[PDB]
Amino acid sequence: TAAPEKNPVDVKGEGNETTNMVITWKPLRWMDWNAPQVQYRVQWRPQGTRGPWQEQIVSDPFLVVSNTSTFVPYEIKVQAVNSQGKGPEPQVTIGYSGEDYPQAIPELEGIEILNSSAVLVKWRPVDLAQVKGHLRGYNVTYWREGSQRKHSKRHIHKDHVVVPANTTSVILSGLRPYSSYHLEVQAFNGRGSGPASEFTFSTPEG
Ligand SMILES: *[C@@H]1O[C@H](CO)[C@@H](O)[C@H](O)[C@H]1NC(C)=O
Ligand SMILES: *[C@@H]1O[C@H](CO)[C@@H](O)[C@H](O)[C@H]1NC(C)=O
Ligand SMILES: *[C@@H]1O[C@H](CO)[C@@H](O)[C@H](O)[C@H]1NC(C)=O
Ligand SMILES: *[C@@H]1O[C@H](CO)[C@@H](O)[C@H](O)[C@H]1NC(C)=O
Ligand SMILES: *[C@@H]1O[C@H](CO)[C@@H](O)[C@H](O)[C@H]1NC(C)=O
């Protein structure tokens, strides 16, 4: 019997609620314990504030951190410990509290009319500090004038395009010539989508 051989890997820090941050790691292989029982030394503090480290020694491979702010980064260290001592100093990982709906509305750059049937919608990248999460993509919902209206579960179908978070334009084809479209653009993360910006445009006679 001796100190633990290695510290855990696969440290992660992600909450399911904007008031918590679940921390997790990979339980150590028993060959790495060097004793018949092993605990995990878990130190954490926000990144930015850098006060004292909060600390807690639990035996399960996870620790629920509560009473947090919405989506804020924490420094995280996990260190195996037993009767004989501690493992090497842990390596520092970063992890965030829960995600929340986005505050950023997307600002227009220009809407370029290509055909009687296609248009290139170009918005600006959103301020990440307003996303309150990991920016996952952008959400572009467009619909036609809407003249007929005889159905419900699927009336005047509002089509939409999903693009990654690092493309700041999209082409929208398949349009009807000489029509009026509305248009909404949203950022989204894991939680949800932010408020939509509103725009209209018109297709040529074709
Ligand atoms: C969040 O995850 C923890 C497990 O770490 C669980 O106990 C809790 O019930 C979860 N809450 C929600 C709302 O999913
Ligand atoms: C909860 O968190 C706030 C800061 O986020 C802190 O000021 C307050 O004292 C905390 N309370 C407890 C019981 O941890
Ligand atoms: C409409 O414009 C798009 C631009 O991407 C192009 O793919 C398509 O060929 C055009 N259609 C016609 C009929 O010009
Ligand atoms: C916005 O995207 C979300 C998920 O990405 C989903 O509710 C939907 O596809 C989009 N919104 C609309 C109104 O289509
Ligand atoms: C999008 O770009 C940012 C920085 O510009 C980057 O950190 C992020 O990982 C990118 N998204 C994906 C899915 O790789």
From Swiss-Prot:
Effect of residue 44 to R: Found in L1 syndrome; likely pathogenic
Sequence ranges of Basic and acidic residues compositional bias: 3-15
Chain ranges of the Fibronectin type-III domain: 7-100, 104-206
Subcellular location: Cell membrane; Cell projection, Growth cone; Cell projection, Axon; Cell projection, Dendrite
Domain of life: Eukaryota
Glycosylation sites noted in the Swiss-Prot or TrEMBL record: 16, 67, 115, 139, 166
Task of the protein: Neural cell adhesion molecule involved in the dynamics of cell adhesion and in the generation of transmembrane signals at tyrosine kinase receptors. During brain development, critical in multiple processes, including neuronal migration, axonal growth and fasciculation, and synaptogenesis. In the mature brain, plays a role in the dynamics of neuronal structure and function, including synaptic plasticity.
Family of the protein in this entry: Belongs to the immunoglobulin superfamily. L1/neurofascin/NgCAM family.
Subunit comment: Interacts with SHTN1; the interaction occurs in axonal growth cones. Interacts with isoform 2 of BSG.
Linked pathology: Hydrocephalus, congenital, X-linked: An X-linked recessive form of congenital hydrocephalus, a disease characterized by in utero onset of enlarged ventricles due to accumulation of ventricular cerebrospinal fluid. HYCX is the most common inherited form and occurs in approximately 1/30000 male births. The primary diagnostic criteria of intellectual disability and enlarged cerebral ventricles are often accompanied by spastic paraparesis and adducted thumbs and, occasionally, visual defects or seizures. MASA syndrome: An X-linked recessive syndrome with a highly variable clinical spectrum. Main clinical features include spasticity and hyperreflexia of lower limbs, shuffling gait, intellectual disability, aphasia and adducted thumbs. The features of spasticity have been referred to as complicated spastic paraplegia type 1 (SPG1). Some patients manifest corpus callosum hypoplasia and hydrocephalus. Inter- and intrafamilial variability is very wide, such that patients with hydrocephalus, MASA, SPG1, and agenesis of corpus callosum can be present within the same family.
Protein name: Neural cell adhesion molecule L1
Gene name of the encoded protein: L1CAM
